[PDB]
Structures are given as C-alpha cells and as structure tokens.
Amino acid sequence: LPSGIELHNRDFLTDAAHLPDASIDLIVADPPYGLGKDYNDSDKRSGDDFLAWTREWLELAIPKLKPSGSMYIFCTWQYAPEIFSFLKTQLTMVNEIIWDRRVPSMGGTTRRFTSVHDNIGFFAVSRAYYFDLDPVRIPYDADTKKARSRKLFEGSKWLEMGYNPKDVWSVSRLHRQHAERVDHPTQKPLEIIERMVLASCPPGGRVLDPFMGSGTTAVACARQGRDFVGYEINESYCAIAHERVNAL
Amino acid sequence: LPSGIELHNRDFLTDAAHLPDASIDLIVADPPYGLGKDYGNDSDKRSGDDFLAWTREWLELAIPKLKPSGSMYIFCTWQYAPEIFSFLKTQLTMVNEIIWDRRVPSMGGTTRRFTSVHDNIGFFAVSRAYYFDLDPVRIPYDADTKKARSRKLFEGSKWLEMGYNPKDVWSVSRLHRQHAERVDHPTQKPLEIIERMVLASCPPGGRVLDPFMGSGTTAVACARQGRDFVGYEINESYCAIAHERVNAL
DNA sequence: TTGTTTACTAGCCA
DNA sequence: ATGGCTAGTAAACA
DNA sequence: TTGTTTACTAGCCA
DNA sequence: ATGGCTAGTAAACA
Ligand SMILES: Nc1ncnc2c1ncn2[C@@H]1O[C@H](C[C@@H](N)CC[C@H](N)C(=O)O)[C@@H](O)[C@H]1O
Numbered sequence: 001l002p003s004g005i006e007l008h009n010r011d012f013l014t015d016a017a018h019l020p021d022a023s024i025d026l027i028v029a030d031p032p033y034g035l036g037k038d039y040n041d042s043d044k045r046s047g048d049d050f051l052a053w054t055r056e057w058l059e060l061a062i063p064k065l066k067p068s069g070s071m072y073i074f075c076t077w078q079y080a081p082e083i084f085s086f087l088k089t090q091l092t093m094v095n096e097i098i099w100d101r102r103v104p105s106m107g108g109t110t111r112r113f114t115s116v117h118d119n120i121g122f123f124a125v126s127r128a129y130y131f132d133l134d135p136v137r138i139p140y141d142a143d144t145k146k147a148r149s150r151k152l153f154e155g156s157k158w159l160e161m162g163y164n165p166k167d168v169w170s171v172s173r174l175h176r177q178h179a180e181r182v183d184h185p186t187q188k189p190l191e192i193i194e195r196m197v198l199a200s201c202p203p204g205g206r207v208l209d210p211f212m213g214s215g216t217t218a219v220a221c222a223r224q225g226r227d228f229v230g231y232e233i234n235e236s237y238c239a240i241a242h243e244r245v246n247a248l
Numbered sequence: 249l250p251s252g253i254e255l256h257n258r259d260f261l262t263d264a265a266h267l268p269d270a271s272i273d274l275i276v277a278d279p280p281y282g283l284g285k286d287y288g289n290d291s292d293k294r295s296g297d298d299f300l301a302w303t304r305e306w307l308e309l310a311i312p313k314l315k316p317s318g319s320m321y322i323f324c325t326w327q328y329a330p331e332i333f334s335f336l337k338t339q340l341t342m343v344n345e346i347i348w349d350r351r352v353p354s355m356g357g358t359t360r361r362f363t364s365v366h367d368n369i370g371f372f373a374v375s376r377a378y379y380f381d382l383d384p385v386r387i388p389y390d391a392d393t394k395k396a397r398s399r400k401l402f403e404g405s406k407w408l409e410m411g412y413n414p415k416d417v418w419s420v421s422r423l424h425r426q427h428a429e430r431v432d433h434p435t436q437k438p439l440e441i442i443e444r445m446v447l448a449s450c451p452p453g454g455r456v457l458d459p460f461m462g463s464g465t466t467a468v469a470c471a472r473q474g475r476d477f478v479g480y481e482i483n484e485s486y487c488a489i490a491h492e493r494v495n496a497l
Numbered sequence: 498t499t500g501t502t503t504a505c506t507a508g509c510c511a
Numbered sequence: 512a513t514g515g516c517t518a519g520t521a522a523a524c525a
Numbered sequence: 526t527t528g529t530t531t532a533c534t535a536g537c538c539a
Numbered sequence: 540a541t542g543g544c545t546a547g548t549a550a551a552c553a
C-alpha cells in the first residue's frame with residue numbers, strides 16, 4: 001500500500017475521534033442512501049431515523065475539514081432536500097451535481113418517472129475553498145472543436161483547454177461485467193470520484209471517505225497522487241479495496 | 249380565446265379566492281427562482297428568507313386548489329430546492345424529483361464552480377391515489393434503437409414495443425432566442441416538458457393551473473392536448489404573447 | 498448479435 | 512398493519 | 526459556415 | 540459603499 005493510503009476496517013463514527021480535526025482537504029462521502037440495500041444494517045434505516053444518523057456522522061466528519069476544505073455527499077432525491085437543508089446551516093453549498101446514471105432503476109413501476117439520477121451536494125467550509133478546474137476540464141475532439149470554434153471564442157480557455165463538466169455528469173453506471181466492477185452492490189464510476197478528487201484537493205492532499213466500501217476514492221487518490229483515509233466496516237469490501245489499490 | 253383556457257393578467261396570491269378549493273387537476277408552477285431576473289417587475293429580486301417565505305405563502309394558497317387526485321410540478325434552482333422541497337414534503341408527498349437538463353449551461357465566466365445546466369422540478373401529489381398516465385408520454389424507439397434494445401427477454405414488453413419512461417432526467421435543450429418557439433420571454437420553458445407534465449398528470453378535460461404562466465407555455469400545452477387551463481401573470485406584455493401563442497393554433 | 502444487469506414497483510385483495 | 516400476486520421496468524457492458 | 530444567446534462570474538481596486 | 544476592470548463561460552438555433 002502506498003504513501004498516504006490508509007485503509008481502516010473500522011466504524012467511522014467510533015473511530016472519527018482518531019482523526020485530527022481540520023486535517024482533511026476533501027471528503028468524498030458516499031454514505032448509505034437509506035434505500036434498504038444489503039451492504040449489515042447501514043442502509044436499512046429510513047425516515048427521521050436515517051436523517052438523525054446522517055446528521056450524527058456528519059457532525060463528526062465536518063470538524064475534520066480544514067478552513068479550505070470542501071465536501072461531496074451522495075444521496076437520493078428522497079432525502080436530499082433535508083440533508084442539504086441541514087448542511088447549509090453548517091457549510092455553504094457551492095454546487096448541486098446530478099449523476100445521470102444513464103441506466104434507470106428497474107422495478108416495474110408505471111406510476112412515476114423512473115430514477116436515473118443521484119444527487120450530490122458540493123459544500124465548502126468557507127469562501128476560500130480550493131477549486132481547480134484545469135485538471136478536470138474536458139477537451140474537444142477535432143470534430144467537436146471545429147463545431148464550437150468561432151472568431152468570438154477563438155483562444156478562450158473553455159475552447160482550447162476544455163469545457164466545465166457542468167453540474168450534471170452523464171456517465172453510465174458500472175455494469176456487473178464492466179472491467180471496473182467488483183463485488184460491491186453500489187459501486188461508483190472512477191470517472192466521477194476522480195473528477196471531484198482532482199477539482200477540490202491539492203496534489204498530495206488528504207481526502208477522507210467515511211464510507212469507503214470498494215476503495216473507489218482510494219483508487220482515485222492512488223493515481224492522481226493524493227493522500228487518503230478510508231472507513232468501511234465490511235471486511236470483504238476492505239479486502240477488495242486493498243486489491244484495488246494494490247494493482248496500480 | 250378558446251373554451252376552457254382562461255388567461256388572467258393579475259397577481260395570483262390575491263385572486264386565489266376566485267379559484268375554487270379542490271378544482272385543479274394539476275398545477276404546473278414555474279415560479280421566480282430568486283435569481284435577479286427582470287420580468288418587467290421585481291418578483292425575482294427576492295432572496296434568502298424573503299424569497300422562501302414568499303414561496304411558502306403562494307404555495308399555501310395554491311395547494312388547497314388541488315383536488316385529492318391532484319398533482320403539482322414546481323420549477324426551482326438548486327440554491328433553494330432543499331428548503332422548498334422540505335417544506336412541501338410537510339404538506340404533500342413527493343412522488344418525483346425531475347432534473348431538467350437544459351443542455352446549454354449558464355454563462356458568466358466562473359472557474360471556481362461547476363456551470364449550471366440543470367433546473368430542479370418537484371413532483372408532489374396530494375394523496376396516494378393521484379392521477380397518472382404514462383402511455384401519452386412514453387417515448388417510442390426508432391427503427392435502430394429498438395433493434396439495439398430488443399432481446400428475447402424483452403420482446404412484447406410495454407416499454408419496448410411502445411415506449412420507455414422519460415425517467416426523472418429530461419435532456420431537453422433550452423430555447424435559443426432565434427428558435428421558432430421562442431417568444432419575447434426572458435425565461436421561456438420548452439413546450440416539450442410542460443406538455444409531458446400536462447399529458448401525464450392531467451386527464452383529458454381536466455383543469456391545469458399555472459399561477460405564474462409567463463409566456464403561456466402551459467396554456468398552449470393545455471390547448472394542444474385538450475385540457476382546461478387557468479393562469480396568472482402580472483405582465484400584460486407576457487399575457488399578450490400568452491394569448492397570441494394560443495390563438496395561433 | 499446477444500445474455501445480463503445495475504443504489505430508488507405498486508395497487509389490490511386478503 | 513401486513514404480505515403476496517400482477518403487470519411491469521432501459522443502456523450498455525462483456 | 527457563421528452569428529448569436531440563453532433563469533444562475535467573481536474577485537479586486539480606485 | 541460603489542461601479543469598473545479583469546479573466547472568463549457553450550450547445551444549438553437561425
Ligand atoms: N459506520 C460505517 N462506517 C464506515 N462504513 C460504513 C458504515 N456503515 C456502512 N458503511 C459502509 O459504507 C459503504 C457505502 C457504499 N455506498 C460506499 C461505496 C463506495 N462509494 C464505492 O464507490 O465503492 C457500505 O459499503 C457500508 O458497508
């Protein structure tokens with residue numbers, strides 16, 4: 001395991017104290033959504049119970065942010081207004097990013113529009129948070145270049161280097177047979193996590209994942225060169241995280 | 249003006265008495281986002297608690313106008329969506345959170361954030377027996393995509409042979425100024441998405457309310473789809489365009 | 498071209 | 512207050 | 526092929 | 540407390 005890469009198979013809430021306050025540049029928080037998934041009982045909480053537990057781990061993770069830190073939190077629309085409304089009292093919301101998973105959730109419903117997107121709250125401790133777009137700009141290919149280029153835009157940073165990813169990221173969910181896929185139920189694309197890691201944490205900086213699971217953020221910090229602290233209570237997920245960071 | 253489509257050049261929050269309680273099948277509300285736009289008025293200049301109290305006020309007037317099967321779509325920005333949705337969940341139940349991918353991002357010149365190309369829409373319902381019909385809004389596959397999707401497991405399926413759910417993310421590009429449908433409105437919404445709402449959550453003949461009709465896109469939607477419509481808008485210029493868009497059908 | 502699957506069925510009736 | 516039966520649900524990876 | 530624009534800069538300075 | 544100046548921000552309509 002590399003320098004700065006820390007994998008703790010420990011309950012984050014008990015072992016948060018073991019992490020120094022104001023010592024993490026970025027928190028990549030993909031916690032249980034409260035959707036009844038089989039991880040333990042972590043995602044088997046619903047309603048005000050789940051909201052209370054969410055707040056409980058958030059008040060432990062927030063103080064560990066440096067004055068320049070930022071945070072991305074994954075959630076479902078079913079709870080996003082409340083969790084975001086709470087986090088707006090503690091930090092400032094810089095963005096709401098929509099992961100358009102392209103592939104919709106199945107079930108067989110016809111009484112509503114099917115879920116295709118996940119909500120991501122992008123918060124910051126202060127207005128002097130760190131944000132660097134250049135590493136995450138998306139380049140135009142030759143054809144997309146020739147289409148967007150005009151003598152009003154020639155030389156513009158968005159044209160030559162790349163455009164802003166925007167607050168909706170259209171990336172397909174990892175198929176079970178995808179090369180990236182491992183033995184985790186709710187994996188996250190490396191594209192997404194890597195974008196966030198590059199855009200809000202200095203090189204060699206510290207990224208905390210209170211609910212790390214497969215080490216997706218761990219892999220994202222291994223490459224791109226950033227320090228990482230992870231917390232996953234499931235032994236098998238920590239194993240797969242190790243294998244994922246020990247193959248780069 | 250056609251029958252069943254009513255256009256009012258007044259303030260909504262004050263004519264709410266006129267509207268009967270439990271008469272509206274569907275509310276399609278596109279309110280001021282609290283963003284500083286100039287609608288010819290200063291309604292979108294409110295921010296923070298001012299904006300949110302004003303929002304909750306007009307909402308407390310609009311909600312009783314929905315009959316039990318009633319539903320509501322509400323446009324908003326991510327800066328105020330958590331609070332607005334949190335309040336509305338105490339009144340009605342949230343069925344969906346639809347994200348309007350406007351495809352074209354907001355301009356300004358920032359490099360410290362992610363440019364906006366999403367608007368939030370809250371889909372709430374009064375009861376669990378709310379009206380909803382997906383078949384009018386199913387998206388049919390074309391001769392190439394259905395072929396790419398058709399497997400023996402899916403042959404004869406409702407979603408394959410007819411059309412799939414539009415999902416809670418609608419990637420409909422914003423209306424360019426030179427676009428044919430575009431009128432002289434600062435924040436015009438495309439006819440596609442409002443027509444989708446009108447077709448799905450309002451039965452043929454039902455009454456739709458747009459407290460902030462603007463250019464009357466909901467009026468055109470209700471006229472083209474055989475649904476009654478009522479609207480409110482203080483700008484007479486916007487109401488004039490709202491008219492013209494309906495008489496042109 | 499094809500098997501298969503991913504964080505988000507639901508309304509009745511009993 | 513609580514299950515079970517039903518008609519039903521996409522895009523994209525290997 | 527090309528002009529033009531649409532609900533959402535941002536920090537500094539005199 | 541107030542503009543102004545800067546360095547910038549894109550898909551898609553006509
Ligand atoms: N108290 C807890 N502390 C640390 N991890 C937890 C805790 N409770 C649940 N978890 C784990 O958090 C993970 C949530 C996952 N959605 C994270 C997946 C991860 N983002 C990935 O891309 O693979 C689950 O695997 C849980 O086992």
Ligand SMILES: Nc1ncnc2c1ncn2[C@@H]1O[C@H](C[C@@H](N)CC[C@H](N)C(=O)O)[C@@H](O)[C@H]1O
Pocket residue numbers: 258259260261278279280287289291433435436437459460461462463464465466480481482483486
């Ligand atoms: N009290 C008010 N009552 C009725 N309309 C109002 C009020 N305040 C502001 N408005 C208008 O509400 C509209 C908000 C816009 N989103 C309407 C756009 C409209 N959905 C369209 O299709 O273009 C503005 O045109 C306002 O002038």
Ligand SMILES: OC[C@H]1O[C@@](CO)(O[C@H]2O[C@H](CO)[C@@H](O)[C@H](O)[C@H]2O)[C@@H](O)[C@@H]1O
Pocket residue numbers: 046047048077078079337340341342343
């Ligand atoms: O608006 C529904 C919304 O509420 C949530 C919590 O955000 O669930 C709560 O409210 C439901 C109302 O239908 C109850 O069924 C549920 O018991 C309660 O927790 C979400 O599940 C849903 O998105």
